[PDB]
Structure formats: C-alpha cells, structure tokens
Amino acid sequence: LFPPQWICCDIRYLDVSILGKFAVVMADPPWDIHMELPYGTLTDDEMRRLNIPVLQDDGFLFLWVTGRAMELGRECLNLWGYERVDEIIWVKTNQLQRIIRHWLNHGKEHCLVGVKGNPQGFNQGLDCDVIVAEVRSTSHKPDEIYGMIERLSPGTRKIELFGRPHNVQPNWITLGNQLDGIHLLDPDVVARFKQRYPDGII
Amino acid sequence: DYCQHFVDTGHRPQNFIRDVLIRLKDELIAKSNTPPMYLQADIEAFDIRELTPKFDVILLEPPLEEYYRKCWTWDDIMKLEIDEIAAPRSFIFLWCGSGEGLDLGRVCLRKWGYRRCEDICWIKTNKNNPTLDPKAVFQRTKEHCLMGIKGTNVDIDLIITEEPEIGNIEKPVEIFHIIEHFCLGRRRLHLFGRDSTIRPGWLTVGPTLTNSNYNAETYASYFSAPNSYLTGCTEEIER
Ligand SMILES: CC1(C)CCN(Cc2ccc3nc(Cn4cc(-c5cc(Br)cc6n[nH]cc56)nn4)cn3c2)CC1
C-alpha cells in the first residue's frame, strides 16, 4: 500500500508506458474553455493526443469537466476507449452547509466516470454520485473523491494526471508540472524510469 | 465527509444542505402569461409541424423506461423533428435522466441545432427514507435537465427536493420557475406534459391529457402585433 509518489513533468511528452497499468485513472485537466484564465491550458488536440490508453486494461477513469469540456471530455473519453457510465457532481458549500452562489449561477462541478474493459472486484454502488463539500481553494477538487475511489477499489494502484502537490496520496502516483521534482518508490517504476530516462531529463 | 457518512448511515450527502424581492418579476410573468393551452396527441403518430407558431421555449420530458424502476427510448426521442417547431432564436430544456441520456440527450441537442449552455441537476434527498442499472459505479441520486440554445441570473443550476414515492414520474415544478425567470419569450411548449403539469403561459402536448382546448389560430392570436416580441417579463401594451 505504497506511500505518495509523483513526477513533475509535461504530461504531453512523458513516456507514460514506464508507469505500468492502474485500476483507476483520475484527470483534472486545465481545458481550453474559450475564456481568458489565470493559468495555462492544453489545446483540444493535445488533450485528444494524451497517451491515456496505455495506462489501463480494465478499470475506471475519473474526468473533471467544466464548460465546453462537458462535450470535449466525453469525446476524449470515447477516443481513449472508455464508455461514460456515471457522472459525479460536487455541490460546492460554505462552512454553514449553504451552496456558494452564464444564464445560471453554477453551484456544482462535474466529474465523468468512464469504464474500460472488464473491471472485476470493484465495490460498485457503495457511494452515491453526489459530493457535498466546502471549496477550500480556487481550482482544487474536493478530497472526498479520494475516499470514494478508495472504497470503490481498495489498495489498487491509481494515477492522477494534472494533480497538484496537496493531491499526492498513498496508492497514487501524481503527474503534473507544478509538483516538486520526482519521488518514486515502486521499484518496477523506478527501474523503467532509470532505463528510459538515464539522465532524469523529461 | 458526507460520502463516508452515507456509506455508514444511508443519509445522502445532499440531505445535509441547509436552506435549500424578485416577486416583482414573478408578478410580471403572471400578468404576461397566456391562458393555459393543452392538446392530447400521440407524439409518435402525430405531425408536430401542426404545432404553430414556432416556440421560444421547448420543455421536453419524454418518459424514459429508467423512470419506472408507452416508454420512449433515445432512438424514439432522437427522431422527433424538434428543429421544425423551434424559433430560430430559442431554448430547449430536455430531461435526460441519469444514464445514457446524459450522452444521447447531447446528441439530440446537436441534431436539432442547439448548443448546451447549462446543465441543471435535480438532486434527490432521502430524508424520509435513509436500485442499480448494471453499468452503474455509484448509486444514482440525481437527474439532469440540459438547457440548449440556437441563434445569438437570480437562479442556480441545482434543484433540491425529496425523492418522489416509487413510480411517481413528475419532475420538480421548480424547473418552470427557472425557465420563466429567464424571460425568453411567451411561446412555451411542454412535450409529454400531463393534466398535472398544465400551467398558465404554456402549451402542453402529451399522450395522457384527458382534455384539449388547443386551436392554432387562437394560440397564434396571443402573439400577433402588438405582442410578437414580448419577453414574458414586461406588462401587456394598452388597448
Ligand atoms: C474541480 C475543478 C473546478 C478544479 C479545476 N479544474 C480545472 C483546472 C484548473 C487549473 C489546474 N491546474 C492544474 C494543475 N496542473 C496543470 C498542469 C499542466 C498544465 C499545462 Br498548460 C501543461 C501541462 N503538462 N503537464 C502538465 C501540465 N499540470 N498540473 C489542474 N487544473 C485543473 C476544473 C474542475
């Protein structure tokens, strides 16, 4: 039940095949949503081209989507070899359990759930598809998703794409370009890393 | 952690959401509204082009087999010629359920010529009572109503109510409040409405209606000059 692992990298260019197969993939990409944004985004094409299909044979993808990414994320999810089988929504609250206030004020964020191949020994139907939790930062997903994923697939290995530092968790490998260097302990991964990247230069 | 909580107790996280002068608008909407009109019509076997004039707002509530834990499949819904009765600038609110409807309803929106601009979630609480499609990963406790627009904010994209009793198929009336608050135009069509959904300001068309009062000419008359462009949120003009 490995402690947290991560790789600061550009996920467009990393050879993800070194990392092996995962029961669960979660991605919270900075989609191009056709609005000016504080942070950098990936184009539609770089999102479609991500080498997601190498990361799993059998299991679930959790894909955070906003705005036109509700449609683009569904495209990407099908291009990558997944069927969308669930959609979680996170109801954003304050500390008093009140909803935080376009044709419409947005009270929620959407996570698409994809299935690939024949997942076996998952505990389906333990949690429900609604998360109610406080917004603690701008641009952070709630920590409860890690709990729901753990109960769904206890002690399996998982990978998060575009995760931030607070998102490093046991049983998870976190990728993104705001993490602090490379911290890898799974010796399978350590060996395939050293072999592919003898000078550590991603 | 209410996910954790739900796993222990069967109280849905949404059970814990507390507290779930715009009467001025509500009054204008009330004064602006046309008399209720309604037509029994078997929508499968009926040329919707008879529904005139072209609608500003369509609320489409097809009876999915999933609502029952004649049903319409997505195959049947996707063949409706909705683009033939929609005004060039208009809105659609499509009730898509919790399953494959979240995908097939988007295909429908694009087929009829709309782009989705909101996703309204009906989140069902089980406070009075603390079922699974085989493909489901999680317990499904919500339904989606997709808002579509073609052509060219008091309210939130959530409706929270208690789960209705078993085989009660009704959608929360709040959806009408959300749609009326947008002031989109006074030609409002509800397809697959019932006796129980009939409402001032709407034309309701559905198979189970017991009575009809619809007349294309009388209905057209409510929207002829001086009234053609009214938003639905402004007074009628004097006479
Ligand atoms: C729950 C939500 C509201 C939370 C925020 N969601 C959008 C979002 C916004 C900002 C954000 N920053 C990260 C971190 N990040 C970004 C990168 C990264 C950026 C680029 Br241009 C190229 C890269 N190459 N390799 C990694 C790259 N890597 N990590 C995730 N993000 C996701 C929407 C849903």
Tab-separated table of C-alpha atoms and ligand atoms in Angstrom:
chain	number	residue	atom	x	y	z
A	1	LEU	CA	0.000	0.000	0.000
A	2	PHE	CA	2.697	2.439	-1.333
A	3	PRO	CA	3.110	5.949	0.086
A	4	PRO	CA	2.683	9.002	-2.176
A	5	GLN	CA	4.711	9.108	-5.441
A	6	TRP	CA	4.887	11.849	-8.044
A	7	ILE	CA	6.676	13.120	-11.209
A	8	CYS	CA	6.921	16.794	-12.096
A	9	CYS	CA	6.709	16.596	-15.878
A	10	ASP	CA	4.975	17.768	-19.026
A	11	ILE	CA	2.357	15.016	-19.478
A	12	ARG	CA	2.254	15.761	-23.233
A	13	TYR	CA	5.860	14.467	-23.573
A	14	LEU	CA	6.337	11.865	-20.783
A	15	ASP	CA	6.587	8.235	-21.964
A	16	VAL	CA	3.728	7.001	-19.646
A	17	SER	CA	4.337	3.286	-20.534
A	18	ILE	CA	7.131	3.179	-17.847
A	19	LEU	CA	4.378	3.599	-15.189
A	20	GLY	CA	2.520	0.250	-15.749
A	21	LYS	CA	-1.298	-0.341	-15.502
A	22	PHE	CA	-3.752	1.243	-12.998
A	23	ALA	CA	-7.176	0.154	-11.622
A	24	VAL	CA	-8.164	3.922	-11.584
A	25	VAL	CA	-7.082	6.959	-13.611
A	26	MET	CA	-8.210	10.445	-12.486
A	27	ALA	CA	-7.566	13.556	-14.556
A	28	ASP	CA	-8.393	17.202	-13.757
A	29	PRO	CA	-7.046	18.882	-16.922
A	30	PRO	CA	-6.784	22.646	-17.475
A	31	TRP	CA	-9.100	22.513	-20.522
A	32	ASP	CA	-9.152	25.327	-23.027
A	33	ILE	CA	-12.674	26.580	-22.102
A	34	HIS	CA	-12.523	29.609	-24.530
A	35	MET	CA	-12.288	32.158	-21.670
A	36	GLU	CA	-9.200	34.090	-20.524
A	37	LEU	CA	-7.853	32.267	-17.428
A	38	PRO	CA	-5.192	32.914	-14.784
A	39	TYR	CA	-3.385	29.627	-15.775
A	40	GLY	CA	-2.112	27.836	-18.944
A	41	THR	CA	-4.396	25.319	-20.747
A	42	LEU	CA	-3.864	22.445	-23.232
A	43	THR	CA	-5.439	22.683	-26.701
A	44	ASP	CA	-8.223	20.302	-27.742
A	45	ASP	CA	-5.630	18.360	-29.872
A	46	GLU	CA	-3.089	17.900	-27.033
A	47	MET	CA	-5.974	16.631	-24.844
A	48	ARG	CA	-7.120	14.115	-27.577
A	49	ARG	CA	-3.476	13.021	-28.162
A	50	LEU	CA	-2.701	12.254	-24.429
A	51	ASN	CA	-1.493	8.637	-24.180
A	52	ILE	CA	-4.303	7.616	-21.711
A	53	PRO	CA	-4.937	4.223	-23.477
A	54	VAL	CA	-1.577	2.789	-22.267
A	55	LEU	CA	-2.449	3.410	-18.547
A	56	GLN	CA	-5.186	0.749	-18.098
A	57	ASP	CA	-6.506	-2.557	-19.464
A	58	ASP	CA	-9.508	-2.864	-17.079
A	59	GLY	CA	-10.817	-0.083	-14.837
A	60	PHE	CA	-12.270	3.386	-14.294
A	61	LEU	CA	-11.343	6.904	-15.480
A	62	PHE	CA	-12.466	9.973	-13.426
A	63	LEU	CA	-12.515	13.029	-15.731
A	64	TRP	CA	-13.240	16.548	-14.299
A	65	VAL	CA	-15.020	18.709	-16.890
A	66	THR	CA	-16.306	22.306	-16.971
A	67	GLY	CA	-17.967	24.432	-19.682
A	68	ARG	CA	-17.486	23.150	-23.258
A	69	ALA	CA	-15.259	20.347	-21.722
A	70	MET	CA	-18.583	18.576	-20.783
A	71	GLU	CA	-18.706	17.770	-24.560
A	72	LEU	CA	-14.914	17.679	-25.257
A	73	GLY	CA	-14.298	15.451	-22.174
A	74	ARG	CA	-16.940	12.999	-23.497
A	75	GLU	CA	-15.175	12.978	-26.871
A	76	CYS	CA	-11.791	12.389	-25.260
A	77	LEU	CA	-13.241	9.675	-23.001
A	78	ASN	CA	-14.618	7.786	-26.110
A	79	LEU	CA	-11.457	8.430	-28.241
A	80	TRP	CA	-9.424	6.896	-25.356
A	81	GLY	CA	-11.508	3.594	-25.372
A	82	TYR	CA	-13.948	4.304	-22.442
A	83	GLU	CA	-17.738	4.294	-22.127
A	84	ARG	CA	-19.139	7.005	-19.781
A	85	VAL	CA	-21.063	5.055	-17.078
A	86	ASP	CA	-21.549	7.686	-14.318
A	87	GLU	CA	-21.282	11.377	-13.655
A	88	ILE	CA	-20.454	12.660	-10.161
A	89	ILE	CA	-21.405	16.199	-9.215
A	90	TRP	CA	-19.733	18.116	-6.395
A	91	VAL	CA	-22.175	20.563	-4.703
A	92	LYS	CA	-19.972	23.499	-3.552
A	93	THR	CA	-20.873	24.621	0.049
A	94	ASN	CA	-19.579	27.204	2.576
A	95	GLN	CA	-18.804	26.225	6.267
A	96	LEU	CA	-22.515	26.560	7.225
A	97	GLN	CA	-23.526	23.873	4.580
A	98	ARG	CA	-25.028	26.598	2.258
A	99	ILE	CA	-24.495	26.375	-1.557
A	100	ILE	CA	-21.963	29.062	-2.817
A	101	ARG	CA	-23.810	31.379	-5.303
A	102	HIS	CA	-23.923	32.004	-17.825
A	103	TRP	CA	-27.739	32.021	-17.692
A	104	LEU	CA	-27.406	30.455	-14.237
A	105	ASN	CA	-25.164	30.645	-11.145
A	106	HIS	CA	-23.061	27.370	-11.117
A	107	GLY	CA	-23.366	25.521	-7.807
A	108	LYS	CA	-21.525	22.362	-8.896
A	109	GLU	CA	-18.606	20.765	-10.774
A	110	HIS	CA	-18.860	17.611	-12.858
A	111	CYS	CA	-16.660	14.507	-12.900
A	112	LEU	CA	-17.326	11.997	-15.716
A	113	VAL	CA	-16.802	8.299	-14.867
A	114	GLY	CA	-15.510	6.030	-17.712
A	115	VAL	CA	-15.115	2.228	-17.778
A	116	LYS	CA	-12.625	0.310	-19.967
A	117	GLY	CA	-12.537	-3.494	-20.492
A	118	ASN	CA	-13.890	-5.859	-17.764
A	119	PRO	CA	-13.237	-4.384	-14.279
A	120	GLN	CA	-13.523	-7.136	-11.584
A	121	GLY	CA	-13.685	-6.964	-7.719
A	122	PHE	CA	-14.646	-3.230	-7.561
A	123	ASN	CA	-17.279	-2.315	-4.911
A	124	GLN	CA	-19.833	-0.578	-7.164
A	125	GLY	CA	-22.761	1.253	-5.501
A	126	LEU	CA	-21.142	1.964	-2.058
A	127	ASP	CA	-21.138	5.745	-2.557
A	128	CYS	CA	-23.656	7.942	-4.321
A	129	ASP	CA	-22.901	10.195	-7.307
A	130	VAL	CA	-23.276	13.449	-5.264
A	131	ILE	CA	-20.433	15.033	-3.190
A	132	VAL	CA	-21.315	17.902	-0.830
A	133	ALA	CA	-18.100	19.646	0.468
A	134	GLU	CA	-16.572	23.077	1.119
A	135	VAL	CA	-14.470	24.929	-1.527
A	136	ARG	CA	-11.119	25.310	0.413
A	137	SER	CA	-9.189	26.763	-2.640
A	138	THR	CA	-9.987	28.052	-6.135
A	139	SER	CA	-9.249	25.278	-8.698
A	140	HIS	CA	-8.966	22.377	-6.135
A	141	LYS	CA	-11.312	19.323	-6.390
A	142	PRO	CA	-12.587	18.041	-3.015
A	143	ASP	CA	-10.591	15.461	-1.068
A	144	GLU	CA	-13.731	13.228	-0.665
A	145	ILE	CA	-13.252	11.925	-4.275
A	146	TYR	CA	-10.088	10.016	-2.994
A	147	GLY	CA	-12.260	8.338	-0.366
A	148	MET	CA	-14.960	7.312	-2.880
A	149	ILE	CA	-12.224	5.915	-5.254
A	150	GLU	CA	-10.512	4.057	-2.336
A	151	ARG	CA	-13.806	2.387	-1.267
A	152	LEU	CA	-14.571	1.523	-4.917
A	153	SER	CA	-11.077	-0.086	-5.494
A	154	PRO	CA	-9.322	-0.694	-2.120
A	155	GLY	CA	-5.424	-0.916	-2.213
A	156	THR	CA	-5.119	-0.940	-6.057
A	157	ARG	CA	-2.603	1.406	-7.785
A	158	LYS	CA	-4.021	4.634	-9.182
A	159	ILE	CA	-2.650	7.555	-11.248
A	160	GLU	CA	-3.732	11.237	-11.214
A	161	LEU	CA	-2.912	13.462	-14.217
A	162	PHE	CA	-2.561	17.226	-13.659
A	163	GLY	CA	-2.580	16.687	-9.892
A	164	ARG	CA	-1.134	19.368	-7.597
A	165	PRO	CA	1.052	18.853	-4.532
A	166	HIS	CA	-1.853	18.637	-1.962
A	167	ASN	CA	-3.260	15.787	-4.248
A	168	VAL	CA	-0.362	13.341	-3.509
A	169	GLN	CA	-1.965	10.325	-1.694
A	170	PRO	CA	-0.966	6.762	-0.744
A	171	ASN	CA	-1.596	4.150	-3.527
A	172	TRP	CA	-1.405	7.126	-6.046
A	173	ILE	CA	1.268	8.337	-8.497
A	174	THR	CA	0.698	12.053	-9.222
A	175	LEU	CA	1.743	13.705	-12.522
A	176	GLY	CA	1.778	17.398	-13.337
A	177	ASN	CA	4.087	20.328	-13.945
A	178	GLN	CA	3.657	22.089	-10.504
A	179	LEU	CA	4.972	19.117	-8.435
A	180	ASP	CA	8.423	19.330	-6.756
A	181	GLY	CA	10.832	17.028	-8.646
A	182	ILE	CA	10.356	13.220	-8.901
A	183	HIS	CA	9.587	10.986	-5.843
A	184	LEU	CA	9.282	7.259	-6.899
A	185	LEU	CA	9.433	4.180	-4.619
A	186	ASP	CA	7.748	1.349	-6.645
A	187	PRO	CA	10.894	-0.475	-7.809
A	188	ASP	CA	9.151	-1.663	-11.102
A	189	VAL	CA	8.538	2.092	-11.905
A	190	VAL	CA	11.992	3.129	-10.535
A	191	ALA	CA	13.757	0.607	-12.862
A	192	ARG	CA	11.680	1.516	-16.017
A	193	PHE	CA	12.230	5.228	-15.177
A	194	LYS	CA	16.061	4.877	-14.865
A	195	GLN	CA	16.186	2.820	-18.143
A	196	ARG	CA	14.011	5.241	-20.264
A	197	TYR	CA	15.448	8.434	-18.668
A	198	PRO	CA	19.082	7.561	-17.758
A	199	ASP	CA	19.806	11.318	-17.174
A	200	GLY	CA	16.433	12.006	-15.378
A	201	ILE	CA	15.626	14.681	-18.132
A	202	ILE	CA	11.896	14.600	-19.096
B	1	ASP	CA	-17.065	13.786	4.853
B	2	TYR	CA	-20.769	13.076	3.835
B	3	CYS	CA	-19.706	10.311	1.309
B	4	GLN	CA	-18.109	8.479	4.326
B	5	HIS	CA	-21.307	9.388	6.311
B	6	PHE	CA	-23.622	7.972	3.519
B	7	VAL	CA	-21.599	4.668	3.409
B	8	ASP	CA	-22.340	4.272	7.254
B	9	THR	CA	-25.984	5.614	7.531
B	10	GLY	CA	-27.769	5.787	4.076
B	11	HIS	CA	-28.232	9.577	4.511
B	12	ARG	CA	-27.273	11.082	1.119
B	13	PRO	CA	-24.752	13.972	1.389
B	14	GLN	CA	-27.466	16.267	-0.140
B	15	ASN	CA	-29.718	15.603	2.939
B	16	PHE	CA	-27.289	17.950	4.859
B	17	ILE	CA	-27.530	21.012	2.519
B	18	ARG	CA	-29.241	23.656	4.659
B	19	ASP	CA	-31.704	26.353	3.443
B	20	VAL	CA	-32.403	24.639	0.037
B	21	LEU	CA	-37.559	40.947	-3.781
B	22	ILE	CA	-37.918	39.039	-7.187
B	23	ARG	CA	-41.717	38.762	-6.593
B	24	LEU	CA	-41.741	41.870	-8.916
B	25	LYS	CA	-40.588	39.620	-11.877
B	26	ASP	CA	-42.950	36.736	-10.752
B	27	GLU	CA	-45.835	39.314	-10.962
B	28	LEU	CA	-44.856	40.498	-14.496
B	29	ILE	CA	-44.505	36.823	-15.567
B	30	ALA	CA	-48.000	36.198	-14.079
B	31	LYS	CA	-49.541	39.295	-15.902
B	32	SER	CA	-47.720	38.424	-19.190
B	33	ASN	CA	-48.781	34.725	-19.252
B	34	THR	CA	-51.170	33.429	-21.988
B	35	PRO	CA	-54.107	31.289	-20.875
B	36	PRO	CA	-53.089	27.632	-20.407
B	37	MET	CA	-53.479	25.619	-23.654
B	38	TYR	CA	-53.246	21.848	-23.927
B	39	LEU	CA	-53.665	19.089	-26.606
B	40	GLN	CA	-53.955	15.274	-26.217
B	41	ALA	CA	-51.662	13.960	-29.051
B	42	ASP	CA	-49.839	10.621	-29.537
B	43	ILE	CA	-46.471	12.324	-30.358
B	44	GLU	CA	-45.147	9.137	-32.143
B	45	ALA	CA	-48.113	9.148	-34.590
B	46	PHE	CA	-48.586	12.947	-34.919
B	47	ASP	CA	-47.011	15.535	-37.260
B	48	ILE	CA	-45.555	18.128	-34.781
B	49	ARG	CA	-45.462	20.627	-37.683
B	50	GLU	CA	-49.195	21.215	-36.739
B	51	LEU	CA	-47.848	22.964	-33.570
B	52	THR	CA	-47.727	26.660	-34.545
B	53	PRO	CA	-46.402	29.197	-34.200
B	54	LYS	CA	-42.626	28.394	-33.718
B	55	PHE	CA	-41.725	28.164	-29.973
B	56	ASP	CA	-39.350	30.402	-27.990
B	57	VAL	CA	-39.011	27.701	-25.280
B	58	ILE	CA	-39.427	23.913	-25.510
B	59	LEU	CA	-39.512	21.729	-22.340
B	60	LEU	CA	-39.159	18.151	-23.432
B	61	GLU	CA	-39.953	15.466	-20.873
B	62	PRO	CA	-40.016	12.096	-22.709
B	63	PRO	CA	-40.984	9.109	-20.459
B	64	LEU	CA	-37.775	7.030	-20.151
B	65	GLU	CA	-38.063	3.356	-19.053
B	66	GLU	CA	-35.492	4.287	-16.379
B	67	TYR	CA	-38.158	6.479	-14.603
B	68	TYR	CA	-40.138	3.174	-13.932
B	69	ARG	CA	-37.520	1.361	-11.734
B	70	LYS	CA	-45.529	3.548	-23.653
B	71	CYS	CA	-41.899	4.409	-22.641
B	72	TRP	CA	-39.751	6.358	-25.149
B	73	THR	CA	-36.147	5.192	-25.930
B	74	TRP	CA	-33.437	7.615	-27.065
B	75	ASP	CA	-33.996	6.038	-30.517
B	76	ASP	CA	-37.605	7.414	-30.496
B	77	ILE	CA	-36.584	10.794	-28.986
B	78	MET	CA	-33.721	11.396	-31.435
B	79	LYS	CA	-36.235	11.007	-34.377
B	80	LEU	CA	-38.511	13.844	-33.185
B	81	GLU	CA	-38.340	16.791	-35.634
B	82	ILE	CA	-37.855	19.376	-32.853
B	83	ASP	CA	-35.884	21.721	-35.190
B	84	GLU	CA	-39.116	22.134	-37.263
B	85	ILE	CA	-41.136	23.837	-34.465
B	86	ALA	CA	-38.282	25.784	-32.702
B	87	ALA	CA	-37.990	29.555	-33.424
B	88	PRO	CA	-34.597	30.477	-34.988
B	89	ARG	CA	-33.630	32.085	-31.651
B	90	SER	CA	-34.993	29.631	-28.989
B	91	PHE	CA	-34.267	27.421	-25.973
B	92	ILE	CA	-34.753	23.744	-25.141
B	93	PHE	CA	-34.855	22.108	-21.641
B	94	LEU	CA	-34.517	18.331	-22.074
B	95	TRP	CA	-34.936	15.918	-19.110
B	96	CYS	CA	-32.184	13.280	-19.783
B	97	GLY	CA	-32.396	11.113	-16.597
B	98	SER	CA	-29.200	9.791	-15.017
B	99	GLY	CA	-27.829	7.281	-17.561
B	100	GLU	CA	-27.100	7.080	-21.287
B	101	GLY	CA	-29.472	10.109	-21.587
B	102	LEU	CA	-26.584	12.321	-20.407
B	103	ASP	CA	-24.829	11.371	-23.713
B	104	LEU	CA	-27.768	10.707	-26.084
B	105	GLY	CA	-29.530	13.950	-24.982
B	106	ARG	CA	-26.425	15.968	-26.041
B	107	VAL	CA	-26.532	14.190	-29.486
B	108	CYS	CA	-30.266	15.156	-29.679
B	109	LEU	CA	-29.488	18.810	-28.776
B	110	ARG	CA	-26.825	18.943	-31.566
B	111	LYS	CA	-29.072	17.076	-34.061
B	112	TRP	CA	-31.899	19.647	-33.581
B	113	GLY	CA	-29.325	22.507	-33.947
B	114	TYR	CA	-28.796	23.632	-30.293
B	115	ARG	CA	-25.593	24.098	-28.202
B	116	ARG	CA	-25.813	23.102	-24.479
B	117	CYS	CA	-25.219	26.224	-22.357
B	118	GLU	CA	-26.411	24.877	-18.928
B	119	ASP	CA	-26.727	21.509	-17.169
B	120	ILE	CA	-29.415	21.671	-14.378
B	121	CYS	CA	-29.146	18.901	-11.793
B	122	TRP	CA	-32.187	17.683	-9.824
B	123	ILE	CA	-30.577	16.317	-6.631
B	124	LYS	CA	-32.890	13.969	-4.749
B	125	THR	CA	-32.697	13.816	-0.887
B	126	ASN	CA	-33.864	10.695	1.039
B	127	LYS	CA	-34.541	12.336	4.491
B	128	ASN	CA	-37.813	10.310	4.839
B	129	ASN	CA	-36.059	7.032	3.744
B	130	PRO	CA	-32.342	6.534	4.696
B	131	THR	CA	-31.733	0.004	-7.286
B	132	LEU	CA	-28.870	-0.191	-9.947
B	133	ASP	CA	-28.508	-0.159	-13.814
B	134	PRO	CA	-25.867	-2.921	-14.324
B	135	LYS	CA	-23.252	-0.397	-15.742
B	136	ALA	CA	-23.560	1.951	-12.679
B	137	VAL	CA	-20.432	2.522	-10.451
B	138	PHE	CA	-22.311	4.681	-7.870
B	139	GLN	CA	-25.824	4.980	-6.552
B	140	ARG	CA	-27.731	7.439	-8.777
B	141	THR	CA	-29.419	10.165	-6.710
B	142	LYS	CA	-29.907	12.923	-9.342
B	143	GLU	CA	-31.354	13.686	-12.835
B	144	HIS	CA	-30.097	16.218	-15.434
B	145	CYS	CA	-32.111	18.754	-17.452
B	146	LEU	CA	-29.948	20.072	-20.334
B	147	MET	CA	-30.533	23.667	-21.471
B	148	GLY	CA	-29.867	24.197	-25.214
B	149	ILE	CA	-29.855	27.420	-27.242
B	150	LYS	CA	-29.871	28.224	-31.002
B	151	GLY	CA	-29.247	31.680	-32.591
B	152	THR	CA	-27.450	34.577	-30.752
B	153	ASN	CA	-29.199	35.248	-13.248
B	154	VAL	CA	-31.274	35.081	-9.963
B	155	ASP	CA	-31.230	31.217	-10.141
B	156	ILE	CA	-28.734	28.324	-9.644
B	157	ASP	CA	-28.186	25.133	-11.832
B	158	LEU	CA	-29.437	22.918	-8.903
B	159	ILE	CA	-32.937	21.872	-7.795
B	160	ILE	CA	-33.013	20.006	-4.444
B	161	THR	CA	-36.158	18.082	-3.405
B	162	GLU	CA	-37.006	14.773	-1.676
B	163	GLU	CA	-37.054	11.704	-3.908
B	164	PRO	CA	-40.701	11.218	-5.026
B	165	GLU	CA	-42.590	7.981	-3.967
B	166	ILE	CA	-41.888	4.932	-6.256
B	167	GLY	CA	-43.332	5.091	-9.855
B	168	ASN	CA	-44.234	8.825	-9.349
B	169	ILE	CA	-42.614	10.215	-12.561
B	170	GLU	CA	-43.057	14.018	-12.005
B	171	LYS	CA	-40.169	16.486	-12.348
B	172	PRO	CA	-39.896	19.334	-9.838
B	173	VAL	CA	-42.141	22.306	-10.756
B	174	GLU	CA	-39.061	24.493	-9.867
B	175	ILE	CA	-37.880	23.809	-13.499
B	176	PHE	CA	-40.781	26.051	-14.675
B	177	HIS	CA	-39.625	28.801	-12.245
B	178	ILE	CA	-36.059	28.595	-13.579
B	179	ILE	CA	-37.345	28.739	-17.242
B	180	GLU	CA	-39.851	31.634	-16.617
B	181	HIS	CA	-37.185	33.677	-14.693
B	182	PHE	CA	-35.097	33.711	-17.945
B	183	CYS	CA	-37.778	35.913	-19.748
B	184	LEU	CA	-37.081	34.158	-23.114
B	185	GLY	CA	-40.404	34.697	-24.894
B	186	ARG	CA	-44.037	33.743	-24.430
B	187	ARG	CA	-44.316	30.823	-26.906
B	188	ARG	CA	-43.631	27.956	-24.455
B	189	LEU	CA	-44.213	24.284	-25.428
B	190	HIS	CA	-44.161	21.352	-22.965
B	191	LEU	CA	-43.965	17.993	-24.793
B	192	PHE	CA	-45.034	14.920	-22.797
B	193	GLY	CA	-46.741	17.180	-20.190
B	194	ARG	CA	-49.779	15.784	-18.295
B	195	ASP	CA	-53.077	17.102	-16.772
B	196	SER	CA	-50.953	17.695	-13.624
B	197	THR	CA	-48.286	19.929	-15.397
B	198	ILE	CA	-50.707	22.313	-17.202
B	199	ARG	CA	-49.745	25.847	-16.378
B	200	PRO	CA	-50.523	29.461	-17.454
B	201	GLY	CA	-48.044	30.649	-20.055
B	202	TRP	CA	-47.615	27.133	-21.549
B	203	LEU	CA	-48.915	24.906	-24.365
B	204	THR	CA	-48.852	21.342	-23.019
B	205	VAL	CA	-48.907	18.486	-25.542
B	206	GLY	CA	-48.897	14.806	-24.468
B	207	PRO	CA	-50.472	11.387	-24.930
B	208	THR	CA	-52.221	11.138	-21.473
B	209	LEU	CA	-54.021	14.547	-21.397
B	210	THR	CA	-57.735	13.857	-20.846
B	211	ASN	CA	-58.888	17.124	-22.453
B	212	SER	CA	-57.815	19.560	-25.216
B	213	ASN	CA	-58.521	23.292	-25.802
B	214	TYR	CA	-55.732	23.885	-28.404
B	215	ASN	CA	-56.573	25.936	-31.540
B	216	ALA	CA	-53.658	27.020	-33.774
B	217	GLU	CA	-55.455	30.269	-34.754
B	218	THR	CA	-56.498	31.235	-31.163
B	219	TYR	CA	-52.963	30.317	-29.945
B	220	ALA	CA	-51.319	32.392	-32.769
B	221	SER	CA	-53.684	35.281	-31.792
B	222	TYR	CA	-51.990	35.661	-28.326
B	223	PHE	CA	-48.635	36.574	-30.031
B	224	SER	CA	-49.784	38.750	-33.013
B	225	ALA	CA	-48.972	42.567	-33.004
B	226	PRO	CA	-48.630	44.441	-30.859
B	227	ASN	CA	-47.351	41.363	-28.816
B	228	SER	CA	-44.966	39.335	-31.115
B	229	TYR	CA	-41.633	40.123	-29.267
B	230	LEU	CA	-42.718	40.407	-25.558
B	231	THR	CA	-40.081	38.698	-23.302
B	232	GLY	CA	-42.682	37.347	-20.820
B	233	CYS	CA	-41.348	39.726	-18.030
B	234	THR	CA	-42.955	43.102	-19.164
B	235	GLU	CA	-46.631	44.388	-18.956
B	236	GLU	CA	-49.116	43.779	-21.870
B	237	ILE	CA	-49.454	47.008	-24.036
B	238	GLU	CA	-52.772	49.021	-23.522
B	239	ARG	CA	-55.860	48.843	-25.901
C	1	LIG	C1	-12.740	20.810	-9.605
C	1	LIG	C2	-12.374	21.848	-10.655
C	1	LIG	C3	-13.204	23.124	-10.509
C	1	LIG	C4	-10.855	22.061	-10.365
C	1	LIG	C5	-10.122	22.796	-11.506
C	1	LIG	N1	-10.436	22.222	-12.906
C	1	LIG	C6	-9.690	22.954	-13.954
C	1	LIG	C7	-8.199	23.041	-13.624
C	1	LIG	C8	-7.617	24.372	-13.467
C	1	LIG	C9	-6.313	24.553	-13.174
C	1	LIG	C10	-5.434	23.417	-12.997
C	1	LIG	N2	-4.162	23.359	-12.686
C	1	LIG	C11	-3.908	22.017	-12.656
C	1	LIG	C12	-2.584	21.554	-12.335
C	1	LIG	N3	-1.740	21.256	-13.468
C	1	LIG	C13	-1.654	21.891	-14.668
C	1	LIG	C14	-0.697	21.150	-15.346
C	1	LIG	C15	-0.222	21.369	-16.704
C	1	LIG	C16	-0.536	22.479	-17.487
C	1	LIG	C17	-0.111	22.601	-18.814
C	1	LIG	BR1	-0.651	24.192	-19.804
C	1	LIG	C18	0.678	21.661	-19.474
C	1	LIG	C19	0.972	20.581	-18.675
C	1	LIG	N4	1.689	19.477	-18.993
C	1	LIG	N5	1.784	18.589	-17.995
C	1	LIG	C20	1.078	19.162	-17.018
C	1	LIG	C21	0.546	20.398	-17.361
C	1	LIG	N6	-0.270	20.098	-14.553
C	1	LIG	N7	-0.897	20.192	-13.377
C	1	LIG	C22	-5.024	21.261	-12.922
C	1	LIG	N8	-6.020	22.151	-13.159
C	1	LIG	C23	-7.372	21.973	-13.467
C	1	LIG	C24	-11.923	22.122	-13.164
C	1	LIG	C25	-12.691	21.347	-12.079
